Amino acid sequence: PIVLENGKLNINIDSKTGCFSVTEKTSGHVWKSDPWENAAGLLTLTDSKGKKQTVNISKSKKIEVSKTAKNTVSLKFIDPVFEDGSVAKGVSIATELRLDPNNAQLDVEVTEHRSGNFTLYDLRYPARAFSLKTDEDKGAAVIPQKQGVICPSYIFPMNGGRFCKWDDATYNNKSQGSLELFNNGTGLTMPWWGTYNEKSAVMGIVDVSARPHMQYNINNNGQYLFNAKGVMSPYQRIVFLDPIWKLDQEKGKMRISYHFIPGGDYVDMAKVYQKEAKARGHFVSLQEKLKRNPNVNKLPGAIYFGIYGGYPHYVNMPGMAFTFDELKNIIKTIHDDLRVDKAFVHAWGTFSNFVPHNYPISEALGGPEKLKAAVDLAKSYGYLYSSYHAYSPMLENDPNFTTDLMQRDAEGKLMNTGSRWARVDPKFQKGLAQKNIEKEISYLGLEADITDITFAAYRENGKEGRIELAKYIDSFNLVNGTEHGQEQWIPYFDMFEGMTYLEDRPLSVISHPAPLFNLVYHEAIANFGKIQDPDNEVTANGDFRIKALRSMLFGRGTTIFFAPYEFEGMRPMIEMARDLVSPVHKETFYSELKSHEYLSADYKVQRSRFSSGTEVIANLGPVAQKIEGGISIPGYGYRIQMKDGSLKTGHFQVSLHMD
Amino acid sequence: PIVLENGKLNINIDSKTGCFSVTEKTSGHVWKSDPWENAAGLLTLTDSKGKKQTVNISKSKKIEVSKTAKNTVSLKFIDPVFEDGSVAKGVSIATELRLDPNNAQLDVEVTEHRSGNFTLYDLRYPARAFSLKTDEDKGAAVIPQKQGVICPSYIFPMNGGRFCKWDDATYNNKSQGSLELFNNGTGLTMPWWGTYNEKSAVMGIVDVSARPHMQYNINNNGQYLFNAKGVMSPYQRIVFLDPIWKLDQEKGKMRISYHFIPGGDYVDMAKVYQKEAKARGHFVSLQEKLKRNPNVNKLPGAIYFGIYGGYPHYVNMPGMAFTFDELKNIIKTIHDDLRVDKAFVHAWGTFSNFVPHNYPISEALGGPEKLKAAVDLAKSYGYLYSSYHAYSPMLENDPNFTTDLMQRDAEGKLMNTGSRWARVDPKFQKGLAQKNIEKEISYLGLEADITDITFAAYRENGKEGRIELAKYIDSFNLVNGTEHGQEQWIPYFDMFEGMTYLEDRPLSVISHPAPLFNLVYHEAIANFGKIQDPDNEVTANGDFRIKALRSMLFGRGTTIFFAPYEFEGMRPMIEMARDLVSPVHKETFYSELKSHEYLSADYKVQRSRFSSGTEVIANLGPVAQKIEGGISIPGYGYRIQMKDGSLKTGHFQVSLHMD
């Protein structure tokens, strides 16, 4: 066995297989290689019949493992062998393991692959590494799926209905699969993931140039590998996360950097990535942004109101569109009646054309002067105001629809024919924004702007055009927001609408929300709830009780998103948000979310600590529970130490009034 | 233009294509054939080279349409043509349309199919029939997906967040796909579906011998047919539901019976099917069941309590398992403290072996005498009691696990390796129940029984063993319940736990729950909320406010399902269910749900009328809304006319208690 070692880690590399283990010397924890099949890697490729097959590369005809430098081991896997015994002759995979000379860090890189007459697809490498043993290790997989989740490596008490779904999911295909980097759907928002138990944590940071996918396996024993064979899995229930190198697509450096943290958990992982986030240039702080624009300080303690008038979906839809006088009256009621001190008013439906033609201000709704009156009222309160804007859509129901603004692929076929809100090629989008955005800023005296869709993901295709549009918008020095966001867009915006949770998502029944993105970026970007899943709607992610408490724990702002006819029903939630969430949001807005903890066995009682000196404890479940020192946190209740030392305690109650 | 006609309907058949239109003569509404491609059917088959392809059978080499009887048109589609222009020589499809001589009914049947040297797969027939034109027809598709949904054929006001998800789904793949019959997952619980507008309704009833799937298209313009070609759809947005006949699987009669109802909607469709359900033998009324077993009358007004002790998933799990003294005390508190007058107490975790060995009563939890003391207390209150029972599982973590009782397929391979709760071949399950159920009934003096899993679906494989188990359990004449249920099992049970809604499901963002199943079967089977989505959990299907109101509208009972440590947090919801839902459930339990209506344009305010003389109006949304007479229904509010003349009015309120 070839050995790489420094003061902190011992890497054992098996000469016959290329599998490796990592001993964290301070704790004695041994991170094992593939516990199921001793596969260093899992390679998907075509066979001589051209059928796709997945092979264990440790069963290749030739394995070369040699220490090519003091802290480098080079591996070569030559001529993999298929299940039927034939050989992918001429296929080879070359990899390196590079141990940092001083730090508990191991770089793993796929340096070369050769296809011969075969075609190569996925490479899980390292395969099924750094795993946790279900119900022995007491820890979790750590996955930055949108705001982030952890998946515990053991069964624990919880509501019986949740418990049945949870446990059942670890025995079927709900607990295995893959996710992608940097989308606004089911995927990850940071290029890292990890596992930890009570002794030890490990995380891998993907090279900035690469886009692997991430395979997950959450307490599954691999039965999915045997169902078509009709046999019971002989493997043990484990937790693992693997990089999937897309060999047919990947043009970057296929490197992942593993960091080993003694006694660490998801918080320590987040803080390690935060240093890398700064090095990558993503981290531009809200204090810096405030220095550049004092109007940033109208965000702390602001409720984000989206007044949804059926636009961009429809122009002047009966029963949904607001007039401009109606808009003004809603703004006035929020301020005078509901005593909301700070607000971001976002009015969806101000233009009489479909996006991406964000103009003119609609005559039917009252015309420019009446909109200006509504905006001038909001400004006189110190509120932020934006209309709905988007430069990416090309809508079937728009009379100005044209495929001329769309993008075509290498075969000349239109792209995103099935995705109406993102059809305009990004290379056109600055020109579309240029048609009226400066005239609207000038006429309405705008201080803020929110733009939909274009910055919700960070994909390679079209990236140059999105950056161009980001720089143009950012040049006006408005307080500016965008839908969902990604870490790459943080330098160009002050707030993200979203960066929370999908309602229906892989892992939902076997994970707990964790503020992983905000543990990294809360000082650099303000986020608010997603308009599709706002705090006034009851969804898979909770009711107002749950969402308000999670808001304070995770450091996000309140989102009230409503059609105009609902407004009267919004009042109690605006009031409770005003009284409970807004002062905590205000106090913690610029600070670092230093730590988050789960304080109860069922993960429902949590504690967050902000560098403002603010501490938030909240109980997101129905039953009072005790924490350290016998303090009891009521169901749907909270206990908050503010910066000045005052203690706030309370809870939400659901009542039935009977006439 | 061959014609079938009677006094109520006019069927116009095209001789060149086989497409037909139906004129419903009372309203004059015309149901058109395929508005997109003039396809009578869509046939999926392999080509010369073995690739699956889907063809328009109206483009076949030869099409014969002849009136072959007074009210029968026979159609023949010979030699379908592929898209490249090659021919499926020797493939044919024969169909018939048979108009009832007197009634507004049209039978449609695939009588013969010949495959030659190709392989036939799916046949949509009739294809894209009985469609609604989006935003022109004001109506809905009607789909008995579990309890049932309707899918409006037009955009309407709703919460802004729901609105974006709704409208967006009609432009992507969320609005197209297929469902299956008689499963406990995403599928249909009754073999019918339909469409209606403001003039007329049509529904199709599938032959009892057949198992087609159901294709849906909910306001989609068919862009999904063109995404791979990378062009824009030229078709218009429509709603349709099609039979999918699985030609490679189907052994029954491929017949569907269309019924045409002037001025009808989903209520009228349900009542049409209710006649066929009685004819099929499914409909055994709760009044007949009460005549056989007076204890059935302990169900009306009962809250269904599941005390989830971590079983069947684990035996005596720390932090989840209850002792029998603890169980007794929970029962005592529910009665003496919470004043719950009627209840079904369901204790999950009473045996020291894993299911399917439902014995012995656990010594570790206290032994048989202490369990008897709990059951005796329950019975002294007039409560029903059951342990958790299941005879279908074969669990990996059971020390007695064996593949001996699992089913194998023709190749000797284990079946359901992926589905741990349904592994025991149903031909063994009566014998497994016989091992101890009679001893338990005898020793505890049981009056009730609930069984998990076995009767949640109605599949062909294993049906006879399931029927044998059902007859055995039914022979004890206990009040008996089962998980989920299906219409075929109604003769054997008094209550179904479930038959409501999955949390995550196809159509969820573009449908409204409608009590289709209970509109048919409320007089015949009692249902309660599903244990995984109980009324005390906040999920995609609502919080307690929404679930309690929907309970009274749809005619189901309350389900409070909790781990023991949660019990104190359940108190407020038990009290609210006690005061609001229980008296309405009690009054309406045996009655027919005569009618259901949506009274607001956002479908949140609804009215149900029961044949007990009870009318339930409730508002499942946040804002007060007015109905006829200018009566206002508060947000999360209700207006209930009871049989005794009293009018119950009230609403739920969320409040913030800041200490």
Ligand SMILES: *[C@@H]1O[C@@H]2CO[C@@H]([C@H]2O)[C@H]1F
């Ligand atoms: C029946 O089936 C399985 C076992 O118990 C639960 C579910 O997890 C019940 F729903």
Ligand SMILES: *[C@@H]1O[C@@H]2CO[C@@H]([C@H]2O)[C@H]1F
């Ligand atoms: C941005 O994208 C589309 C359009 O508006 C919504 C969504 O439907 C917003 F989220």
Ligand SMILES: [Cl-]
């Ligand atoms: Cl875009």
Ligand SMILES: [Cl-]
């Ligand atoms: Cl959040």
Ligand SMILES: [Cl-]
């Ligand atoms: Cl079964």
Ligand SMILES: [Cl-]
């Ligand atoms: Cl329901």
Ligand code: NA
């Ligand atoms: Na800005």
Ligand code: NA
């Ligand atoms: Na019975």
